[PDB]
């Protein structure tokens, strides 16, 4: 073969980029991407808190670098939003001293670097934010486009401004959370990593963004055991998720959450399931059941009826190709990461067996 | 009470509809019996961009026709030279779930966004060989369904929140908003008169906007189901539209109505992307059928097919000079047909 130096350099860039991509391919394949769904009364937030207890510590130096660039981007975006607001406002808010209006220029110039936050920028923005008239401008602009937690970043800046500093992960998560649209509520069990993706701050229609999640290893459909009447709407949400052409191949875990709240509702005897579901009068606790000690059989009959209603929908269509896996839980259950893991394993195994034709 | 407004709206809508029917003196398919059909179009996968990592969701050509961006829900925005198949850049993303990307008309910048409602802009003319976010043009309330650059300081974005929005990039404060749709908005296309951009609703309709006017000049509606993709005919006078209804449709602005449907009873799969050849004479559509169909834009002949994908076609693009047709499937493979 023959190349110019230009082609060779681009080929070495291509191979350098390839080696980088091949390193990321290992991280990608090693992560079980795992869409989370559930009507917001279903406490899916409280479920991801039971994942975040396993995510106790900052993920790695490479993840920490990725959030340093985000901390710096929100430091820059919050102070430049103020720097243009103090130009756009009708008050001639050139500072108390001309040096801050000169250092404002070298902020706009010095923010343009595709490298680490140099000590000059930190030195400028603390001297700016020391003027209480900037805190008053932050309260004048309180409903304009600004990062609402900017007063955290510009106060913590003192600790940010020097090499090898680390923030605690709730400051990072708080920095990132806005009108976000998803949350990547990461966790790991037995050194298996789940990028669980919650969907939230996102509009009432599913049928287009669901066509992203077609490759997630499983869908966790969290659903509220206790808010029957609403339950029948979630049963249609599950029926829709299940039959949807672009999810045909992906297995659904169900969490029947708020079991205890249903149990107390059933112990209260309101038993509106009989009204909302006449089939309850015919249905009875199957001998499949393995209840907890001290359950009222009615509580078993309720939970297993509801569960069997989801399973009925799961059984009616497509179950030749994708399973669904019910679990009974409450937000206190530490075992939820282990429940997710066991049936994530099963979903992968019971997928391989389709292609090894053992099924 | 709304009734009088719903009767007024009905009457206006009826007048608009009836006036269209009056202007529909003939179909396009009538007068194009003057036209020799295209020779049945043959193409081969004269490249495959094998090295992508997960399913490619979107792509866009650079105006130089040489480079193209592609983005995938592995979270890599990968920039390919179509000539050498060199991965000239591969840019990691602040969260993986892209749904769209675009190339600045200069080639200076690239953009993408997705279910994380954040748009981001990147500068390829780095000072130091590292590409990073120039600005994070956040502020939508739904997923950013499609981006296009008007200019290296102006970008329009669709959303699931029903709003198209134009951003002055340097300001980054939602510099115009075009709220008039219902449901999501799937896809955008810009005329060479970049003042005009069409956006496909996730209702049946398409709306034409003018960037300065800040509201829809027109609302085309011939489709039955969601418009998945949209593209101006190359002179800007007309635009194609794919739908989950499986039909392709061509609309002309001045006719304000459907000039030509493309369909077969064989083809139940929704169209997922559309674009024209440089002459406009070929309209290319990807499907849930992995085969692309190529249509004679004037004859409605299924003049050819591009079979060479093994999963849904996610996106399509024709170079500025019409030399070749990128197609991003839900395989990692981006195939450059020609």
């Amino acid at each position, epitope marked *: 073969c023959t190349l110019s130096a230009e082609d060779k350099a681009a080929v070495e860039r291509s191979k350098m980029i390839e080696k980088q991509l091949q390193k990321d391919k290992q991280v990608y394949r090693a992560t079980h991407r795992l869409l989370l769904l559930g009507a917001d009364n279903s406490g899916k937030s409280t479920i991801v808190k039971q994942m975040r207890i396993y995510h106790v510590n900052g993920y790695s130096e490479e993840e920490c670098k990725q959030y340093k660039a985000v901390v710096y981007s929100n430091t820059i975006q919050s102070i430049i939003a103020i720097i243009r607001a103090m130009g756009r406002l009708k008050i001639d808010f050139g500072d108390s001293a001309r040096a801050d209006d000169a250092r404002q220029l070298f902020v706009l110039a010095g923010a343009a670097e595709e490298g680490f936050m140099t000590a000059e920028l930190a030195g400028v923005i603390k001297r700016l934010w020391k003027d209480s008239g900037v805190q008053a401008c932050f309260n004048r602009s309180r409903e304009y486009q600004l990062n609402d937690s900017a007063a955290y970043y510009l106060n913590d800046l003192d600790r940010i401004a020097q090499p090898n500093y680390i923030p605690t992960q709730q400051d990072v998560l708080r920095t990132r959370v806005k009108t976000s649209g998803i949350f990547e509520t990461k966790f790991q069990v037995d050194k298996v990593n789940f990028h669980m993706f919650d969907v939230g701050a996102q509009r009432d229609e*599913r*049928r287009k963004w669901i066509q992203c999640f077609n490759d997630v290893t499983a869908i966790i459909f969290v659903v509220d055991s206790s808010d029957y009447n609403r339950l029948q*709407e979630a049963l249609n949400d599950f029926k829709s998720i299940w039959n949807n052409r672009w999810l045909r191949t992906i297995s659904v875990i169900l969490f029947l959450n708020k079991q205890d709240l249903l149990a107390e509702k059933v112990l209260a005897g309101k038993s509106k399931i009989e009204d909302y579901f006449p089939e309850f009068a015919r249905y009875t606790t199957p001998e499949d059941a393995t209840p907890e000690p001290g359950e009222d059989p009615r509580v078993t009959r309720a939970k297993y009826f509801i569960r069997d209603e989801f399973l009925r929908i799961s059984t009616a269509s497509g179950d030749g190709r994708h399973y669904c896996y019910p679990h009974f839980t409450c937000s206190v259950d530490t075992e939820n990461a282990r429940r997710i893991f066991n049936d994530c394993r099963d979903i992968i195994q019971r997928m391989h067996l389709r292609q090894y034709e053992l099924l | 009470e709304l009734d009088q407004l*719903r009767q007024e709206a009905e009457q206006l809508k009826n007048q608009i509809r009836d006036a269209r029917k009056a202007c529909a003196d003939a179909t396009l398919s009538q007068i194009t019996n003057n036209i020799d059909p295209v020779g049945r179009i043959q193409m081969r996968t004269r490249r495959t961009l094998r090295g992508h990592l997960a399913k490619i969701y979107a792509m866009h050509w650079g105006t130089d026709s040489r480079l193209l961006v592609s983005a995938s829900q592995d979270g890599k925005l990968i920039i390919w030279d179509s000539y050498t198949t060199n991965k000239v850049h591969a840019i990691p993303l602040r969260s993986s779930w892209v749904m769209t990307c675009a190339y600045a008309p200069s080639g200076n910048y690239v953009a993408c966004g997705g279910l994380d409602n954040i748009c981001s802009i990147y500068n390829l003319k780095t000072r130091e060989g590292n590409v990073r976010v120039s600005r994070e043009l956040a502020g939508h309330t739904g997923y950013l369904s499609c981006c296009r650059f008007l200019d290296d300081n102006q970008i329009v974005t669709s959303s699931g929140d029903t709003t198209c929005a134009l951003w002055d990039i340097e300001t980054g404060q939602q510099t115009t908003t075009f709220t008039g749709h219902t*449901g999501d908005v799937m896809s955008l296309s810009l005329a060479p008169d970049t003042r005009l951009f069409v956006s496909g609703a996730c209702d049946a309709s398409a709306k034409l906007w003018d960037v300065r006017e800040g509201m829809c000049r027109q609302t085309f509606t011939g*489709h039955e*189901s969601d418009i998945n993709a949209i593209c101006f005919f190359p002179n800007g006078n007309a635009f194609a539209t794919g739908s989950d209804d499986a039909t392709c449709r061509l609309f002309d602005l001045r006719a304000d109505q459907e000039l030509m449907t493309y369909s077969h009873d064989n083809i139940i799969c929704g169209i997922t992307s559309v674009s024209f050849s440089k002459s406009g004479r070929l309209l290319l559509a990807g499907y849930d059928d992995f085969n692309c169909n190529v249509w004679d834009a004037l004859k409605a002949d299924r003049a050819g097919v591009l079979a060479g994908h093994d999963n849904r076609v996610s996106c399509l693009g024709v170079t500025d000079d019409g030399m070749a047709v990128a197609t991003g499937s839900w395989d990692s493979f981006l195939k450059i047909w020609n």
Partner: nanobody, 128 residues
Framework: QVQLQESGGGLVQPGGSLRLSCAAS????????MNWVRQAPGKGLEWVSD????????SYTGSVKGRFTISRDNAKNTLYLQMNSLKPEDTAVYYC?????????????????????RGQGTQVTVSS
């Protein structure tokens, strides 16, 4: 183009019976699964009933199994809802809702607020 109009609502006595109907236009109706969806006071958009393209596959919300019945005519491009043994809480705006896309089982979004392929609704009052 795509245009829907519900009909046959109004006041009716509790325990009474009534047929709603919907005329659908501007699309090939036989290709679509069809739904009735209701907005009572305080409730959200509850899915009430659905009918397949064939008219054969059918289901109902559990509080409406047997009490109502749904049917369609693929030639007349129309959807009917027979209602019987009406409970006062069945008082709602009833909407004819198409599933989003043709040849589907799927039927997402028919209960979503601001959804496209749903009519103007007909009010039904179950009261005396």
């Amino acid at each position: 183009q795509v245009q829907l109009q519900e009909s046959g609502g109004g006041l009716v006595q509790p325990g009474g019976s009534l047929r709603l109907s919907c005329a659908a236009s501007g699309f090939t109706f036989s290709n679509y699964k069809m739904n009735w969806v209701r907005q009572a006071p305080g409730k959200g958009l509850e899915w009430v009933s659905d009918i397949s393209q064939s008219g054969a596959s059918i289901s109902y919300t559990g509080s409406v199994k047997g009490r109502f019945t749904i049917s369609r005519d693929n030639a007349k491009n129309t959807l009917y809802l027979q209602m019987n043994s009406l409970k006062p809480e069945d008082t709602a705006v009833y909407y004819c809702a198409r599933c989003p896309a043709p040849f589907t089982r799927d039927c997402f979004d028919v209960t979503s607020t601001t959804y496209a392929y749903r009519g103007q609704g007909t009010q039904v009052t179950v009261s005396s």
